[PDB]
Amino acid sequence: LFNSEEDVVKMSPLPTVENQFTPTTAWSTSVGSGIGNFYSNLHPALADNVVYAADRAGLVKALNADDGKEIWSVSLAEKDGWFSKEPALLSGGVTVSGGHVYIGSEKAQVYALNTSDGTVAWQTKVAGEALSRPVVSDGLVLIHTSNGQLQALNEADGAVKWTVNLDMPSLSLRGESAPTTAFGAAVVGGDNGRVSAVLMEQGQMIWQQRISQATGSTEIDRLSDVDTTPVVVNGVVFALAYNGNLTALDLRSGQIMWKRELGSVNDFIVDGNRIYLVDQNDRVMALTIDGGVTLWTQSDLLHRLLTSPVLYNGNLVVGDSEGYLHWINVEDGRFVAQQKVDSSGFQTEPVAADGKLLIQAKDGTVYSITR
Amino acid sequence: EVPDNPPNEIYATAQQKLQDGNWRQAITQLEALDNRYPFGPYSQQVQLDLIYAYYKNADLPLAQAAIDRFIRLNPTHPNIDYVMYMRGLTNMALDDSALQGFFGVDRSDRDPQHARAAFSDFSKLVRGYPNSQYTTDATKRLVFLKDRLAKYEYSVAEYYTERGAWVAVVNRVEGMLRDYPDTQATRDALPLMENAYRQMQMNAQAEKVAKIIAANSS
Amino acid sequence: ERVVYRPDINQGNYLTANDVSKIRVGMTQQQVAYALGTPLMSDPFGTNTWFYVFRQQPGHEGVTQQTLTLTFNSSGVLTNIDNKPAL
Amino acid sequence: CSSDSRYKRQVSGDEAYLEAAPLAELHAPAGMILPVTSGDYAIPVTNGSGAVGKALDIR
Amino acid sequence: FVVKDIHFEGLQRVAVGAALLSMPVRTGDTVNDEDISNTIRALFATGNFEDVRVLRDGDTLLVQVKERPTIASITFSGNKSVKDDMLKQNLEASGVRVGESLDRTTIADIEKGLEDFYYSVGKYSASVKAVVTPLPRNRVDLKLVFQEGVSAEIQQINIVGNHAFTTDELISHFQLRDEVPWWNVVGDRKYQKQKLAGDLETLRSYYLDRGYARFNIDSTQVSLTPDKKGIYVTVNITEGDQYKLSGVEVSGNLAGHSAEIEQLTKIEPGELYNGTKVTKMEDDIKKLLGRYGYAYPRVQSMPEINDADKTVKLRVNVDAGNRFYVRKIRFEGNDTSKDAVLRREMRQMEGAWLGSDLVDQGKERLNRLGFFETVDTDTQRVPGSPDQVDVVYKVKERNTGSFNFGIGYGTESGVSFQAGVQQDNWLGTGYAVGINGTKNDYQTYAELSVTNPYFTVDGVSLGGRLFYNDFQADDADLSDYTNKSYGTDVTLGFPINEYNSLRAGLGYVHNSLSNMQPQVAMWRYLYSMGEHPSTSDQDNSFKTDDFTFNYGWTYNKLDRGYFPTDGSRVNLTGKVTIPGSDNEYYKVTLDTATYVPIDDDHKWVVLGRTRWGYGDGLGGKEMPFYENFYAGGSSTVRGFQSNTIGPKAVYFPHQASNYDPDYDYECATQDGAKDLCKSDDAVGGNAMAVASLEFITPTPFISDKYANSVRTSFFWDMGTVWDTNWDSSQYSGYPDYSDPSNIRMSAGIALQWMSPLGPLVFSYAQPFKKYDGDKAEQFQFNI
Secondary structure, three states, X not given: OOOOOOOOOOOOOOOOOOOOOOOOOOEEOOOOOOOOOOOOOOOOEEEOOEEEOEOOOOEEEEEEOOOOEEEEEEEOOEOOOOOOOEOOOEOOOXXXXXXXXXXXXXXXXXXXXXXXXXEEEEEEEOOOOEOOOOEEEOOEEEEEEOOOEEEEOOOOOOOOOEEEEOOOOOOEOOOOOOOEEOOOEEEEOOOOOOEEEEEOOOOEEEEEEOOOOOOOOOOOOOOOOOOOOOEEEOOEEEEEOOOOOEEEEEOOOOOEEEEEOOOOOOOEEXXXXXXXXEOXXXXXXXXXXXXXXXXXXXXXXXXXXXXXXXXXXXXXXXXXXXXXXXXXXXXXXXXXXXXXXXXXXXXXXXXXXXXXXXXXXXXXXXXXXXX | OOOOOOHHHHHHHHXXXXXXXXXXXXXXXXXXXXXXXOOOOOHHHHHHHHHHHHHHOOOHHHHHHHHHHHHHHOOOOOOHHHHHHHHHHHHHHHHOOOHHHOOOOOOOOOOOHHHHHHHXXXXXXXXXXXXXXXXXXXXXXXXXXXXXXXXXXXXXXXXXXXXXXXXXXXXXXXXXXXXXOOOHHHHHHHHHHHHHHHHOOOHHHHHHHHHHHHHOOO | OOXXXXXXXXXXXXXXXXXXXXXXXXXXXXXXXXHOOOOOOOOOOOOOEEEOOEEEEOOOOOOEEEEEXXXXXXXXXXXXXXXXXXX | OOOOOXXXXXXXXXXXXXXXXXXXXXXXXXXXXXXXXXXXXXXXXXXXXXXXXXXXXXX | OEOOOOEEOOOOOOOHHHHHHHOOOXXXXXXXXXXHHHHHXXXXXXXXXXXXXXXXXXXXXXXXXXXXXXXXXXXXXXXXXXXXXXXXXXXXHOOOOOOOOOOHHHOHHHHHHHHHHHHHHOEOOEEEEEEEEXXXXXXXXXXXXXXXXXXXXXXXXXXXXXXXXXXXXXXXXOOOOOOOOOOOOOOOOEOOHXXXXXXXXXXXXXXXXXXXXXXXXXXXXXXXXXXXXXXXXXXXXXXXXXXXXXXXXXXXXXXXXXXHHHHHOOOOOOEEOOHHHHHHHHHHHHHHHHHOOOOOOEEEEEEEOOOOOXXXXXXXXXXXXXXXXXXXXXXXXXXXXXHXXXXXXXXXXXXXXXXXXXXXXXXXXXXXXXXXEEOOOOEEEOOOXXXXXXXXXXXXXXXXXXXXXXXXXXXXXOOOXXXXXXXXXXXXXXXEEEEEEEEOOOXXXXXXXXXXXXXOOOOOOEEEEEEEEEEOOOOOOOOOOEEEEEEEEEEEEEEOOOXXXXXXXXXXXXXXXXXXXXXHHHHHHHHHOOXXXXXXXXOOEEEXXXXXXXXXXXXXXXXXXXXXXXXXXXXXXXXXXXXXXXXXXXXXXXXXXEEEEOOOOOXXXXXXXXXXXXXXXXXXXXXXXXXXXXXXXXXOOOOEOOOOEOOEOOEOOOOEOXXXXXXXXXXXXXXXXXXXXXXXXXXXXXXXXXXXXXXXXXXXXXXXOOOOOOEEEEEEEEEEEEXXXXXXXXXXXXXXXXXXXXXXXXXXXXXXXXXXXXXXEEEEEEEEEOOOOOOEOOEXXXX
């Protein structure tokens, strides 16, 4: 009653919970510390029976992907600077490649924890922390900074290859434009509502396409966590603009194949021809790869902050940042299992790796899920 | 005020409250007449009633705006002889209005700020309408305001004697010189500058004042 | 009368010793007006005399004054450098 | 609730603008005439009267 | 075709002939159907014709139009925190209003700008909905729905490129608040971009005076985090490698004041660099030259930051200007005030050079005026020579008049009244008005206190004060403790400093007493008066005409004469008697007004408000005990009932007061209780030591057009009054009032409401510490 008189606007819950399948967990091994209330694009990785889970608060875990048993644990809570034991404060998600675990920090100081023990098999202070996960690929650590600096490193020491300012809006227009490699070309979206292609070998712009409006004189959405990480099918960039406006366009020239340049889309998979997506309508849709034609759709999850679309246990699986997990029809949009396993909700996305389904919640963090 | 009513009936209700002297209630009609019909035919006459009715209701910030409205409404108009006179009169009421005159206390020592502004409008009347029904009326204010400015200017010239700032004595009376060629307070300010010269040991320059004092003893 | 704390009266519109040596008779008003500017009093009906006169009162300690008037001709060219101390 | 006579409201007003008079023009001898005019303080005197002061009241 | 006539339908604001000018066709001009369509678009280009159908009756045109004009109302719904008008200013920004032409297309773009206002104001989680409601003859209501969820709030700051100062304590230097802790509750923590730009310059000033002079903020980027509230922000700076303040090489138009410059350029060569000191020292020169006449002292520093030895070298370029800038000064805001009141309140004189501080001191006597609402001016350099600055002191004046509360028993039940009225320099005419008194059926008091505060040039405060008390306290008659008392005092003000002025004068007082109480300390005072009365009877009358020399002094370096925030004002007071007085005594007292601003904007101010006083006899005769001190329910120790702190009147076992009121006003009298009885009425001691500790606070729920007229202030009240001559050998079974540890405690909040007749103070104060006769009234409703 002592908070019963104030007033804010409202966003709709999740209707039609259906559980024709039984959903379970694979195990629980929650770090607990993790995202929490503090939003970040950090997300775990899962490889080699190791659930690579952690926090930006400092602790690094190696959970055994049978039970989530702690294999090793180190901590990147920083022992020095202006104070001992200051939290890790990580920008990007967990990249695990080779004998290295890479996470970009918000200190712009990046590491390579040797995956077998978590010992920093090399570190590197970099120039500007990332709006993306550190894209460690092809000898290089591809970085889209907070400043939008295309920085490539060497993934054995962090030997910085270049630093190139990208498509840059006014403020930190918060979107993971991860610099992807498509056929030796650095391919990235853009938080300025536009898209670009760059030579991955030296940092040389293949093309840059102005695509969609961003905030400033045409104000667009700040609830859609747009995947400005491009998912290019070999010659056609399939990616989101910073407003979520969709276009299909050539990899090699940027020439528009088709568009749904109307979007508020958050997360997407280009699944074959049937493009599964997350709106900020929070309505699921299967779009087509040749014209974004709705093959099927589902608005059963309106005003839910959902996670990424994944296919697991033969069903389209999606969780939310509320703790609800949903086994969508792979076809038209029916919950075949629905799982409320968390109250903290899942900010990271489902990693359908090691035969499992890894999601890290905000504070009920690591819930490995099966059915 | 008034609902969306017949405008002449609103105007006649206003016209009765003109004859009522119900300036609190006439403007209640006169606004809602022009709140719905400012393009109406007597709505410009409503403003010419309103400048009268504001001043009758002592509504000077409204009498401010309505004149400046009629500046923008009718920059040419025959009734600007009414307007430019009342613009000084609005300033005349705006400058000095206290109840200390009922106690028999002067207000010419108070600021002639709008009295300066009225001194414009009254002179802007008799330049703009030198043949008006208000021309000698404003000129009688222009007679009256000028010495009221001078009695103000004499009062501020007094203190510099009492301060002893004889430099500030001279230039204030020099302002009283260039403004007023006839005011008696300037003739009362006349020997004090001669004192100020003799208090600045400029007695020879003060002797020039004495000959004008000789030329203006009576 | 027996008051001693008398808050001090001061006044400018005057010149210092360099300013007296900075000018000379035959200078124009403008020649003064470049180096010394205007006085804060001139001659309003007689021939132009440029009044740079110091005034000051020390509290129950007398009076302080440096009087300096500068008559030009009708061409505004210097004819007089009057220097005068206090009373 | 109704009150009545003996001074419900205050009264004020004056013809003070009429009560002034144009004052004594200052003569100065030769060599001592200085200017005495500045803008509207040299008033533009024009005639054509109308009723003066509150003797004239219009709409 | 050619048009015979144009059927001018549908105007609703616009004149027909002006619309005929908008029509390319004009009543006999040649008509083609393209010009008909040109007549269509031009009425659309008029911006008032919601439909245009220029048609024709064969060749004569017939224009059918629907009208955009006057919006008859624009009604706002849901603007809880945001002002109607600033929302309406966006309509005025978009050129629409009540009475304007409504294009029904112009809803969403302005609605965008309303949400783009919601964008800029600190939210984005707030949407709008303009609703059109058609009103008579073409008109429309613009109903406006506002769907205000919540603003965006500051969440986190990321700072990189900083290497020597911790990010969180840097935020603590900033106003970028994102915390109200659970065991530390402070003000709130929302967002504004103006906080960001300023606290950048807090950081810009931060590394500056450390020594970092190649310090530079590289960039900063605020997170457009997809939640409408998430404010994280990257800050990119360059630390910039602290430099040693190694030397100043000032020159320029030094105007012969070069030595005076050099004390202002006293630095330590090689100390860590302080550009704020440079920022300060430039102003000091501009104050140095500002007092030397140079009104435009152009001072251009150039720190030659020598990174080769990690130092910095201060070039400073000086252009002083002319000297005798002060030609004259002007004043405005005098339309009720006296010009000589204004003109006497200056120190920088016309016809002089600039002493800039005398202007500010001349502003400070205007600050210490208290009969103002704004202190301001216009220091206009009159064009031409640099000797013509005419300083136009426009100021805002203040109000006047005040009335004392509390009047009468009944309405026509015997004419009794309590009064008091102050006309506040008699409307600022130079005639300080303080008038009070009361006529009752038990006592009658009269008083005047008039002052020409500047009767002559020395601050001469012609303070004439008279009183007359026909005081009887008639219980049945004058038999019960009458003291008629009457007399006068003329007092003056004196030139002491420019912030100090003395108070001195001579007080006449004649008293006339009849048959006062069996209080033994009264009898003891009478025995100290060498008078030998009857103690068991109130039968002793007395006439005394004392002749006293009063004295005092004022200090004044506190902010405002009416609404101060900072400084102090010391108020010396007191009296002594003379040879010729009917009683030989003294009394000294002083109370303070001290302002300790918690805020450096001085919006929170600790108030130092204490009271000190002591009086005793000069020898032989003693101080009268009506000249004692009293407290509680009173001046700023209150929340009690009135004057309920002090010693008590222990009554003699008494017989005859010449009438006891017969089981009323019993004084251990013939009507029973014939024994020594200590009173509960605090008759006060010969020493005063009390105080109150008060705290200026605003209230964030009041409109600040008149919240600034209001001083809300909590307090704590404490102290005691007690008599240094109290000898508890006689008060052996009674308390001692030679004790300074009789200290009470009351606390509460004071509420200054500026009414049109001056401020109005009302308060509630609970004493949680009480003693003998500390009678209570916690709610205090005063003037």
